Amino acid sequence: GVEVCVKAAVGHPDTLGDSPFSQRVLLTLEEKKVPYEMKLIDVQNKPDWFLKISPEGKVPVFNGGDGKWIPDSDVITQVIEEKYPTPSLVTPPEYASVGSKIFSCFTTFLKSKDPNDGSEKALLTELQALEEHLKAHGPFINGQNISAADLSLAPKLYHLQVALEHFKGWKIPEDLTNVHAYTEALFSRESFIKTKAAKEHLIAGWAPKVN
Ligand SMILES: O=C1O[C@H]([C@@H](O)CO)C(O)=C1O
């Protein structure tokens, strides 16, 4: 039986949390229909049994059954791909890095207390780049259908949308038609609904960092 340890909601240890790296792994298992047991970890009060298997406190960690817990959502989703090849979620190498700078540009903008430091323009630039790729190779990152790159980016765009809307009243411009089509499609997938954090918990996860 496959098991995964993921972040719990801040202040709510029995509730699924908002780690986008955790969600990437959960989405992968859900989309590949792999049965798994989810273990919720309060990352501000990690249980000792967990530190024994993840001594650096890394979350998520994945146990494919083969008697070992592995970290790093990149590595984990590759291991899952190898163990459960169908449906294939392989993203072509040429598209692997589509949207790679979006999350970091988002977190900088989110935490920016200077409305004119160019952190917004940076984010738009990356969003613009994503909009161009989907315009040419939509609807997903590999046209159709869904692949690993989508399951990595979707959780991050969810953070961007919810957090920027809440903390800065900022929205992805309507002009970016393909991106809006993209997030609408991805966020409404059964797997995404099942594995996403309630928005209040995502907001709670970011609030201390904003302040
Ligand atoms: O990047 C992340 O988004 C959430 C949020 O809670 C910020 O801490 C978190 O746990 C991640 O590591």
Side-chain angles (χ1 to χ4, degrees):
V2 170
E3 294 179 1
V4 60
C5 294
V6 304
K7 181 194 186 193
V10 297
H12 299 87
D14 295 321
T15 300
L16 179 56
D18 65 321
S19 167
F21 305 105
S22 290
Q23 195 190 4
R24 176 189 185 181
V25 175
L26 297 180
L27 282 173
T28 303
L29 295 156
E30 291 285 341
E31 289 290 349
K32 288 176 174 289
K33 314 302 301 185
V34 177
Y36 63 98
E37 179 184 345
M38 184 173 73
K39 298 195 182 302
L40 299 172
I41 307 298
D42 182 353
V43 295
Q44 290 178 36
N45 182 34
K46 301 173 202 81
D48 178 52
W49 65 260
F50 180 72
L51 289 160
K52 275 165 179 167
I53 58 163
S54 191
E56 298 170 284
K58 299 174 165 169
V59 190
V61 285
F62 171 88
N63 190 322
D66 61 342
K68 70 171 174 175
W69 291 91
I70 61 170
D72 189 330
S73 74
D74 282 321
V75 176
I76 292 167
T77 60
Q78 294 194 303
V79 164
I80 292 163
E81 190 72 51
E82 300 176 349
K83 187 162 174 51
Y84 312 93
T86 314
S88 186
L89 288 179
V90 172
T91 303
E94 48 271 36
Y95 300 146
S97 60
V98 173
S100 69
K101 301 289 293 189
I102 293 176
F103 193 64
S104 62
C105 283
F106 145 69
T107 66
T108 297
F109 179 42
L110 174 67
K111 293 194 281 228
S112 175
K113 302 167 184 180
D114 188 339
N116 284 285
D117 62 17
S119 60
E120 181 186 0
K121 192 171 183 180
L123 177 59
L124 287 166
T125 295
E126 297 301 333
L127 281 177
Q128 186 55 42
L130 177 58
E131 172 77 358
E132 287 307 306
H133 172 82
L134 293 178
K135 179 192 304 301
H137 305 100
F140 301 107
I141 287 160
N142 195 31
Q144 53 192 65
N145 319 313
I146 199 179
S147 57
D150 303 304
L151 302 185
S152 174
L153 187 56
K156 295 168 173 176
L157 296 174
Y158 181 65
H159 280 266
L160 183 162
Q161 174 185 108
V162 177
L164 290 188
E165 184 61 294
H166 194 256
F167 290 106
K168 305 223 177 189
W170 186 99
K171 308 171 72 176
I172 288 179
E174 281 300 308
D175 342 328
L176 303 186
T177 292
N178 300 92
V179 178
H180 282 285
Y182 187 72
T183 58
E184 286 169 20
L186 284 170
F187 298 166
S188 67
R189 288 184 74 83
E190 277 190 10
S191 70
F192 199 90
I193 300 172
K194 185 168 182 183
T195 61
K196 77 182 190 60
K199 289 179 188 177
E200 61 267 28
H201 297 143
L202 191 149
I203 288 168
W206 283 111
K209 305 182 175 186
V210 174
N211 318 330

Short mmCIF file of all heavy atoms in Angstrom, two decimals, residues 7 18-21 103 159 202 205-206 209, ligand 1:
data_model
loop_
_atom_site.label_atom_id
_atom_site.label_comp_id
_atom_site.label_asym_id
_atom_site.label_seq_id
_atom_site.Cartn_x
_atom_site.Cartn_y
_atom_site.Cartn_z
N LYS A 7 1.43 18.05 4.31
CA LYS A 7 1.18 19.12 5.28
C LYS A 7 -0.30 19.20 5.69
O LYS A 7 -1.19 19.19 4.84
CB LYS A 7 1.62 20.47 4.69
CG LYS A 7 1.42 21.66 5.60
CD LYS A 7 1.54 23.00 4.82
CE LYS A 7 1.51 24.19 5.77
NZ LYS A 7 1.30 25.50 5.06
N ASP A 18 -2.11 22.97 2.67
CA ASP A 18 -1.99 23.73 1.43
C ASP A 18 -0.61 23.71 0.79
O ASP A 18 -0.27 24.62 0.01
CB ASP A 18 -2.39 25.19 1.68
CG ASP A 18 -1.44 25.90 2.63
OD1 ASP A 18 -0.99 25.29 3.62
OD2 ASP A 18 -1.14 27.09 2.38
N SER A 19 0.21 22.71 1.10
CA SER A 19 1.50 22.60 0.43
C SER A 19 1.32 22.31 -1.06
O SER A 19 0.69 21.33 -1.42
CB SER A 19 2.35 21.50 1.07
OG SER A 19 3.47 21.21 0.24
N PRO A 20 1.87 23.17 -1.94
CA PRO A 20 1.66 22.89 -3.37
C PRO A 20 2.49 21.69 -3.83
O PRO A 20 2.17 21.06 -4.84
CB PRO A 20 2.12 24.18 -4.06
CG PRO A 20 3.09 24.82 -3.07
CD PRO A 20 2.60 24.43 -1.70
N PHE A 21 3.52 21.37 -3.07
CA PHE A 21 4.43 20.28 -3.42
C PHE A 21 3.79 18.97 -3.00
O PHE A 21 3.80 17.98 -3.74
CB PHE A 21 5.80 20.52 -2.77
CG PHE A 21 6.36 21.87 -3.12
CD1 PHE A 21 6.36 22.91 -2.19
CD2 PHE A 21 6.81 22.11 -4.40
CE1 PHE A 21 6.86 24.16 -2.54
CE2 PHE A 21 7.31 23.37 -4.76
CZ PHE A 21 7.33 24.39 -3.82
N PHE A 103 5.71 30.75 -9.63
CA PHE A 103 5.52 30.67 -8.18
C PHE A 103 6.44 31.61 -7.41
O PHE A 103 5.99 32.31 -6.51
CB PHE A 103 5.73 29.24 -7.70
CG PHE A 103 5.25 28.99 -6.29
CD1 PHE A 103 3.90 29.10 -5.98
CD2 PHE A 103 6.13 28.62 -5.29
CE1 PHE A 103 3.45 28.85 -4.69
CE2 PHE A 103 5.67 28.36 -3.99
CZ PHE A 103 4.33 28.49 -3.70
N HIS A 159 -2.42 28.88 -5.41
CA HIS A 159 -1.87 29.79 -4.41
C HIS A 159 -1.83 31.22 -4.90
O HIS A 159 -2.26 32.14 -4.21
CB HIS A 159 -0.47 29.35 -4.01
CG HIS A 159 -0.47 28.24 -3.02
ND1 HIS A 159 -0.39 28.46 -1.66
CD2 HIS A 159 -0.57 26.91 -3.18
CE1 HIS A 159 -0.44 27.30 -1.03
NE2 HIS A 159 -0.55 26.34 -1.93
N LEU A 202 -5.36 28.13 3.23
CA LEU A 202 -4.30 28.63 2.38
C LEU A 202 -3.96 30.07 2.79
O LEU A 202 -2.78 30.44 2.89
CB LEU A 202 -4.74 28.56 0.91
CG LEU A 202 -3.72 28.80 -0.18
CD1 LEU A 202 -4.05 28.00 -1.44
CD2 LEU A 202 -3.62 30.30 -0.49
N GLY A 205 -2.07 29.98 5.96
CA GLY A 205 -0.70 29.52 5.76
C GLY A 205 0.20 30.68 5.36
O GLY A 205 1.37 30.75 5.77
N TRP A 206 -0.34 31.59 4.56
CA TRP A 206 0.44 32.75 4.09
C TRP A 206 0.42 33.97 5.00
O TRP A 206 1.30 34.82 4.88
CB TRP A 206 -0.06 33.20 2.71
CG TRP A 206 0.43 32.33 1.62
CD1 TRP A 206 -0.31 31.47 0.85
CD2 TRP A 206 1.79 32.18 1.21
NE1 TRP A 206 0.51 30.81 -0.03
CE2 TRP A 206 1.81 31.22 0.17
CE3 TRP A 206 3.00 32.76 1.61
CZ2 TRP A 206 2.98 30.84 -0.48
CZ3 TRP A 206 4.16 32.38 0.97
CH2 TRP A 206 4.15 31.43 -0.06
N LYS A 209 3.54 35.16 6.91
CA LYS A 209 4.60 35.53 5.98
C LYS A 209 4.33 36.88 5.33
O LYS A 209 5.26 37.62 5.00
CB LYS A 209 4.77 34.44 4.92
CG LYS A 209 5.01 33.07 5.51
CD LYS A 209 5.21 32.02 4.42
CE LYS A 209 5.58 30.67 5.02
NZ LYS A 209 5.93 29.67 3.98
O1 LIG B 1 5.01 27.13 -0.75
C1 LIG B 1 4.17 26.82 0.07
O2 LIG B 1 2.78 27.33 0.17
C2 LIG B 1 2.29 26.95 1.56
C3 LIG B 1 1.96 28.13 2.37
O3 LIG B 1 1.42 27.73 3.63
C4 LIG B 1 3.19 29.01 2.61
O4 LIG B 1 3.87 28.55 3.75
C5 LIG B 1 3.41 26.20 2.12
O5 LIG B 1 3.27 25.36 3.24
C6 LIG B 1 4.32 25.89 1.13
O6 LIG B 1 5.58 25.34 1.44
#
